[PDB]
Structure formats: structure tokens, C-alpha cells
Symmetry: D2
Subunit: 46 residues, 4 copies
Amino acid sequence: DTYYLQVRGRENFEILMKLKESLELMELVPQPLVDSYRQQQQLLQR
Amino acid sequence: TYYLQVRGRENFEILMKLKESLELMELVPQPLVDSYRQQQQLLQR
Amino acid sequence: EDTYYLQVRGRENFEILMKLKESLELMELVPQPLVDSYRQQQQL
Amino acid sequence: DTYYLQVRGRENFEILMKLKESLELMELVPQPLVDSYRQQQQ
């Protein structure tokens, strides 16, 4: 279920933390918003 | 609103996934972010 | 190989994604023996 | 320094590993190639 990742460099660490945060948080978003968002993307890039 | 370009399909798909997570995150109310961030303080240094 | 674009909402988001595109694209200027050696270690 | 983070979800962990790999490898690129690449972006 849970994984451990090691990184060298503070700047790299902080960067990965921001992405870890966004990735973990989006699981608290109701699926129809997620799906709505992906529908929208289809007009925004190929 | 800003535009970036990237070489490589795999690279493109990776950036779309992160873009999604970064953009969706703003639809998460602030109290759930706080409750999430407080929790992280127990999970890594 | 091919070239794709994307749109991003937010300057913070764009700056984050730019750093990541950079590393993703720069990585291919890395000699393959150095890629293989790094992967050798990481695995252990 | 070395740092660790915990992450929930195998796919989340998988995306993050590739970005970890790319950020570390990229430190190997000689600086002139990095500067050249940046200006080319502009």
C-alpha cells in the first residue's frame, strides 16, 4: 500500500514533496470532478 | 494560463498526470489541505 | 521523438512543471553508461 | 544530503520515481549544455 522513496538534494526533495502533496490530495476529490476535469482537457490540448 | 511544449510522448504523459494533480488540488478545500499537511509531519522529516 | 504541448493554469504550477520538463528532457543528454550505472545502484 | 518521503499509491510512487530519477541524472549534465538548453527554451 505505502511506498518509500529516497532522494538526494534538498531542492529535489522539496520539489518531489509538492508533487507528492498534489498527487495524494487529488484522491480526496470526488470522481465526477476528476472526470469533468479530464473532459475539459480535451479542448485544451491534443 | 501558460503553455509548454515537450519532446517525447512518455514525457508528455508524465507532465499531463502532474498537471492534473496540481490543477485539481485547488478544488480541495483548505481545511482538508491543513489536515493533510499536519498529518505529513508524522510521516516524514 | 514527437512534440506535444500542454496548457497550464497558474504561474506556480507552470514553474513546477517547467522544472520537471527540463529534467525529463535534459536526462537524454546523459551518456547511457552513466544512466546504467545509476540504475545499477538505485536498484540496490 | 539524502532525504526520504512516504507516498500512498503504487502509481503515485511510480510517477514520483521517474521524476526522482530525472532530477538526479540531470545533475550529471555539464553546465554549458544546461545553459544552452535553457536559452533555447526562451
